[PDB]
Amino acid sequence: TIPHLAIDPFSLDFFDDPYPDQQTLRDAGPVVYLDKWNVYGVARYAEVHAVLNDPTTFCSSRGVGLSDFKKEKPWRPPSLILEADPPAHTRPRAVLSKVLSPATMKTIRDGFAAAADAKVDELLQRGCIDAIADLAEAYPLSVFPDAMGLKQEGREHLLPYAGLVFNAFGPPNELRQTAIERSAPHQAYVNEQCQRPNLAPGGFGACIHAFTDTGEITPDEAPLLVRSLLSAGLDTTVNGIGAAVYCLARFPGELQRLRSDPTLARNAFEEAVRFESPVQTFFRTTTREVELGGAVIGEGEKVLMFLGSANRDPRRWSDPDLYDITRKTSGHVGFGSGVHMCVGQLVARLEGEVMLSALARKVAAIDIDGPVKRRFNNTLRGLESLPVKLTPA
Ligand code: HEM
Ligand SMILES: CCc1ccc(C(=O)O)cc1
Ligand SMILES: [Cl-]
Numbered sequence: 001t002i003p004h005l006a007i008d009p010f011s012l013d014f015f016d017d018p019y020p021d022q023q024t025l026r027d028a029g030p031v032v033y034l035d036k037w038n039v040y041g042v043a044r045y046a047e048v049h050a051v052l053n054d055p056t057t058f059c060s061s062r063g064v065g066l067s068d069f070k071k072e073k074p075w076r077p078p079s080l081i082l083e084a085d086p087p088a089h090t091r092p093r094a095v096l097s098k099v100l101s102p103a104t105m106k107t108i109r110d111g112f113a114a115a116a117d118a119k120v121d122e123l124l125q126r127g128c129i130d131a132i133a134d135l136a137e138a139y140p141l142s143v144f145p146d147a148m149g150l151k152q153e154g155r156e157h158l159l160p161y162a163g164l165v166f167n168a169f170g171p172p173n174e175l176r177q178t179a180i181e182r183s184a185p186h187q188a189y190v191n192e193q194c195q196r197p198n199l200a201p202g203g204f205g206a207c208i209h210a211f212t213d214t215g216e217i218t219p220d221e222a223p224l225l226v227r228s229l230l231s232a233g234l235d236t237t238v239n240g241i242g243a244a245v246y247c248l249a250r251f252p253g254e255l256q257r258l259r260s261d262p263t264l265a266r267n268a269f270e271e272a273v274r275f276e277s278p279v280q281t282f283f284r285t286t287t288r289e290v291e292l293g294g295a296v297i298g299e300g301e302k303v304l305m306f307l308g309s310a311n312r313d314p315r316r317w318s319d320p321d322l323y324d325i326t327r328k329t330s331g332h333v334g335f336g337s338g339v340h341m342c343v344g345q346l347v348a349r350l351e352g353e354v355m356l357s358a359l360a361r362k363v364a365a366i367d368i369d370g371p372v373k374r375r376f377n378n379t380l381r382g383l384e385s386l387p388v389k390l391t392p393a
Contacts, residue, residue: 002295003028008036010170015376022309030293037171039302043309045316047293051284051305052337058284061085065169075168080224091216092225096343099207105346108147115143116354120362124392131386136242139355144234149203154189161186162235170378190230194223204229233344237351239382243276244269247323249366249388254325262360268325269352274332275323277308280381307333365391
């Protein structure tokens, strides 16, 4: 009843061009079985959305990577938020919601916008730049570590640590194995920065520790919650901004519309998140036998959700393979959906908005002018290098 497919969604060939295989996954049925990894897969919008919104049946506390925490030891102590189910999830989630709230956004927006404008002005002086290293990476590195309250020394560990976290959700392939082999210095740096004395006053880290006296979290929970922001808060935005710049570089008609109405910046970023889905996949584990799309999945089974495929499913989206900055994007699953839906999404959208606003106001054209190189990661989709020429407005 359930079709069995040999597609490896964690192979380099799949990462290089996932779209044909994602269509094969959607069109084979609402639920597939991936023989390569012994997991169920859901690639259509409807089933991905259904799984995300039933956390009781499709739990996160057995891991949101391939590994089942009931069977194997987690590679690092479980996240108190991403790898927790209600009710244990609820209070840590509330703390991060308040740390990354609107009032916080108001406190950081002017500095984030000024750093975005300054980066674009700097890049325009060079003209020909790498939109990954010099923009997608450089801009978040210029705002987010400071907003966390990290010291300067050791920040070179942040992107390697995040690449490790995202590779570690994958199966035990070479990408995952190599990341874990190299992990010790990055883990040691990150864990140390999570301690209260190492987080500067007023930043996100200090604010997490300050919530340890309200009864929502205890002091011994704060370091791991800081760890969540140092895991999820940087490389995601690198790949979100990279996705948006890559979309504007490939679709100059949309850059032209954005230049003509810079207030489209927020939706242009949201549409890049749908179109590229920087976070491609996450797993859940069934807690009982369950019927999903006419299929019967037993207890204790891993279910792989293809967020990027759900975001391009023609059953849900008109012209899904077109980048359209005025698209009604509400309901895309690039930030997840339901109780675990990205708690940092206001930070991500702020960074994306102010960078796209700076481009919309300062840049007339973005032309690819060198070889594009893709970066391979078991969970993140994005580029290693994007050579572009920026023409000033
Ligand atoms: C474009 C940027 C981003 C994308 C595409 C993204 C994507 C996601 C997705 C898909 C989830 C759902 C995980 C699940 O359902 O298992 C998630 C959750 C989460 N994200 Fe984001 N994220 C982004 C930026 C950020 C930022 C900037 C932060 C922190 C400052 C952050 C922190 C978190 C945390 C802590 C969770 C776990 C929430 C929970 O389990 O309740 N993310 N993100
Ligand atoms: C953006 C995906 C993500 C969310 C949360 C964590 C974490 O809690 O460590 C790590 C990754
Ligand atoms: Cl760690």
